[PDB]
Amino acid sequence: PLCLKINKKHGEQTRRILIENNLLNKDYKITSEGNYLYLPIKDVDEDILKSILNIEFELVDKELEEKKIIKKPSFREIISKKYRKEIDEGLISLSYDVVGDLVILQISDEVDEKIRKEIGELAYKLIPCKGVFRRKSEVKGEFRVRELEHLAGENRTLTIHKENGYRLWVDIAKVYFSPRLGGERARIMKKVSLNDVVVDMFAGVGPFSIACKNAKKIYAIDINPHAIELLKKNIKLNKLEHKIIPILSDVREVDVKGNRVIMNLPKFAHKFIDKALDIVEEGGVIHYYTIGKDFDKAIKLFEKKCDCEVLEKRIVKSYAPREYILALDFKIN
């Protein structure tokens, strides 16, 4: 539409200025005819333009040059405006998880299924994925899985996830995985000492183990057959066939010792402090996870257990208003 014909010699320098005074119309693209450039501009006058532009220019009334070029908004952008109220009532969430090429939203079932489908639709439209789900139930069961409800894109739950350089087969509907724990996996990764024997008591599809590939031997344990199938595919996928030993079993009845022991089962980890201390060697170290309103009982209930030494204590994430997931590493003597 309202263009500003200028010589290309001053294109960039002109665009810059026009952008600072916020005049460059952002709906159309800068076309070009010869030694000139047409720069879509918002309605202003010749003199105020002459003031901010140290050069010659015509306000040619060129043709639209096409039609508006919309800036694809962000899922968050649109969803924020359209539903601030229930986002504020806790029915729709702006945060979401993405595992491989699958996204998992959070929408309360109090919200209508038609809306949930439309929102799952925006997500598919506006977010780089192949499929969209939402959390159907909470994390429950001994396998620690959750119900999902497909909403858009492919109805698939198998995908490959990347974090810290490695890749992982994950079926978000048959096992427990949190893309959110990648940083946690990263710390511990810079601790494995190539001659360490690691015990992953609740290995899942194996992300913690794989993050400990430096060590000598790794023992990935898990009672969930579905988890073990994947764990195995990931060992091969990561060419770690001879460092990680998958073990379909209840950790309780497994005889292994190790200097590095991981207990990622924050809900019922306390029910296993014993079996760990067992597996862990004299000088060994046990990475323990749990929940609580604070670190108290976490350390209090480990004291009356052994010659421990709180190597490092931190907060992973709020579990609910107040309750937190904590990670303590213990030095055994």
Added chain:
RNA sequence: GCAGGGGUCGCCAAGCCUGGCCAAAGGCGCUGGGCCUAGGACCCAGUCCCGUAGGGGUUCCAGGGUUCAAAUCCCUGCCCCUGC
């Protein structure tokens, strides 16, 4: 290497065809602040570097080069996973 793919601001991942509101979307992580509950959460803000800002300085694996203008186009040094 004859259907040929890839390295983007901690980890992921948009953009690249078609150069121009790109310091570069989102998610996660990290920081601060709310939230007695969506329970392995959720809301607000920040997150390349300097500033209170306006703005400035440096980035898209590393050079060179084309362009008024390059993460986007062109020969090219190192590295990596699918391959009538």
